[PDB]
Design an enzyme around this catalytic site. Sequence first.
Site, PDB file in Angstrom:
ATOM      1  N   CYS A 205       0.964  -1.235   0.013  1.00  0.00           N
ATOM      2  CA  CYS A 205       0.112   0.058   0.023  1.00  0.00           C
ATOM      3  C   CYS A 205       0.995   1.265  -0.153  1.00  0.00           C
ATOM      4  O   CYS A 205       2.068   1.188   0.165  1.00  0.00           O
ATOM      5  CB  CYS A 205      -0.913   0.060   1.019  1.00  0.00           C
TER       6      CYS A 205
ATOM      7  N   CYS B  64       0.790   3.378   3.770  1.00  0.00           N
ATOM      8  CA  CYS B  64       1.158   2.448   4.679  1.00  0.00           C
ATOM      9  C   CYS B  64       2.427   2.984   5.733  1.00  0.00           C
ATOM     10  O   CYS B  64       2.498   2.749   6.904  1.00  0.00           O
ATOM     11  CB  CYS B  64       1.531   1.166   4.388  1.00  0.00           C
TER      12      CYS B  64
END
Length: 103
Positions: free
Chosen positions: A30, A33
């Site tokens: 991601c 993140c």
Amino acid sequence: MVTQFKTASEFDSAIAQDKLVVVAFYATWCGPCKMIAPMIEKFSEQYPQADFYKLDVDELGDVAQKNEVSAMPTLLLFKNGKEVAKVVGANPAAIKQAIAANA
């Protein structure tokens, strides 16, 4: 340092604590993140009285589902087996204020 989980059992165990547990739930693939990495670390950096844990949905997706985390990065605060806060975005001050509020 924010402690690493191993399974949903680990998540649930930290949840059942009679103290503020904020879980850094994100995924290594991601984008933002990496914001939950230092921002959440910074939370307990101020107040280590709260429990610092983190886990990647990339590694444990069924865990993500166990916690109701589909969005990423996600922050989940719980107390004593029940929630206290649910966040899907690193908010430096507002979430540090959250952890302290739910504590």
